[PDB]
Design a protein around this ligand. Structure first.
Ligand SMILES: NC(=O)c1ccc[n+]([C@@H]2O[C@H](COP(=O)([O-])OP(=O)(O)OC[C@H]3O[C@@H](n4cnc5c(N)ncnc54)[C@H](O)[C@@H]3O)[C@@H](O)[C@H]2O)c1
Length: 403
């Protein structure tokens, strides 16, 4: 019997729990720490089965029904004896789960982020301590499905599923269950999983600069006058915004080349141009592909998507404060900046977007080119935990002097 613990209670947690518990020879436990969310789930389900509805390529639908072993808020019941532990939640909630699992997790456990976002490995090392050198750490690029809850604790719907997906791995001293084949078994036929070359490859290929750049391109020098309706979002960019994206992508390459030269034996060669990425994955949907401006604006998958807005005098105005900036900056752009400082590489285009975005949400992280901001302790940069060198970033070990 393979024992699995799922952490969370949203769209992603509903889908994963239902599919995994339907497999022969698997036992599933659910843990959530958001007030009394676990008691609410148990009461709504009762004696019935959980249902997952899957939309197929034909136009037909398939139903899956199962029942988990236990749903609780107690970490002693959920974590003890588990072979795999998987986190599927927004990034600001990760700190709480690492603290709760610490006294109960076994040496041979496999810890997975689905999705991890940026700074996942640094945080795990700080909280678990010496134990972090025994276990293994696995990080995925994004969520496997597009999904939404229909009825709390009872029903969830899958709108689509990716064809392929990739993940990185750091191995410890203890022997675990095989990472690639075990994860494939839980999900089914699709998506087909593969392994990436390095964990720092996965970190920077996040392209954290994308959404902040699109918002800056349209509202950067706004005078304060309203518009008739909500304008297009990806398909509404200008040539100047396209040149901004190219410059930020070039800076990602400069950082990767500097690490390989200073620390031989670390393979970061699969880090690529953003223009190369678009043509490899979106080829069937693009009408005209001769440059980056035409590749984005003529993409069929971006049809009809608009900016977030709100009602004002004589029209509409941009609505800030959702999650485009509150997650992508402290859990993304700021982490990349910390790595660049340690390598000694300047990044002027990335710096400009950071200073503008932090002011719009009322926070402070970067001051005069240094990480000394008022809210610096709420980020995931390596310097926050005391990892100040490239050797410390790679291994997790700190240097000591001798008299
Ligand atoms: N759902 C999708 O179609 C989709 C697609 C691609 C990527 N993603 C990404 O995957 C991640 C997870 O997606 P999701 O839709 O499952 O998230 P979600 O919004 O549905 O998750 C909500 C859950 O998070 C926890 N939570 C929320 N606020 C909390 C707080 N104040 N304190 C403590 N816990 C709190 C609760 O347990 C809650 O049930 C997100 O980062 C999202 O951007 C989602």
């Amino acid at each position: 019997t393979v024992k699995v613990c799922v952490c969370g209670g949203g769209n992603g947690a509903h889908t994963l729990s239902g599919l995994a518990a339907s497999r022969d020879g698997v036992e599933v436990r659910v843990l959530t720490l958001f007030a009394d969310e676990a008691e609410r789930w148990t009461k709504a389900l009762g004696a019935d089965e959980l249902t997952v509805i899957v939309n197929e390529k034909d136009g037909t639908q398939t139903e899956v029904k199962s029942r988990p072993k236990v749903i609780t808020k107690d970490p002693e019941i959920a974590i003890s004896g588990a072979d795999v532990v998987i986190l599927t939640v927004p990034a600001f909630a990760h700190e709480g789960y690492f603290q709760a699992m610490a006294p109960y997790v076994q040496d041979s456990a496999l810890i997975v982020g689905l999705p991890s976002q940026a700074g996942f490995e640094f945080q795990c090392r700080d909280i678990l301590g010496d134990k972090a050198a025994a276990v293994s750490m696995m990080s995925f690029e994004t969520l496997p499905w597009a999904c939404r809850i229909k009825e709390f604790g009872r029903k969830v719907e899958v709108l689509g599923t990716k064809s392929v997906l990739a993940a990185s791995l750091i191995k410890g001293t203890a022997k675990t269950v095989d990472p690639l084949s075990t994860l494939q078994m839980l999900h089914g036929a699709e998506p087909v999983f593969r392994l990436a070359k390095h964990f720092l490859e996965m970190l920077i290929m996040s392209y954290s600069f994308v959404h902040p750049a699109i918002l800056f391109g349209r509202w950067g020098s706004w005078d304060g006058k309203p518009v008739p309706e909500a304008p297009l979002f990806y398909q509404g960019i200008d040539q100047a915004t396209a040149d901004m994206l190219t410059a930020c992508s070039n800076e990602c390459k400069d950082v990767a080349n500097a690490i390989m030269a200073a620390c031989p034996g670390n393979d970061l060669s699969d880090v690529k141009d953003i223009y190369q990425w678009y043509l490899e994955y979106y080829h069937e949907d693009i009408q005209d592909d001769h440059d980056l401006y035409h590749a984005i604006t003529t993409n069929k998958s971006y049809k009809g998507l608009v900016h977030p807005v709100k009602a004002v005098d004589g029209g509409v105005a941009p609505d800030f404060g959702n999650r485009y900036l509150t997650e992508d900056i402290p859990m993304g752009m700021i982490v990349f900046k910390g790595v660049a400082i340690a390598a000694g590489v300047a990044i002027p285009s990335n710096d400009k977007l950071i200073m503008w975005a932090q002011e719009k949400i009322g926070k402070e992280y970067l001051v005069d080119g240094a990480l000394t901001g008022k809210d610096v302790a709420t980020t995931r940069c390596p310097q926050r935990y005391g990892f100040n060198t490239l050797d410390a970033i790679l291994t997790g070990k700190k240097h000591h002097h001798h008299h």
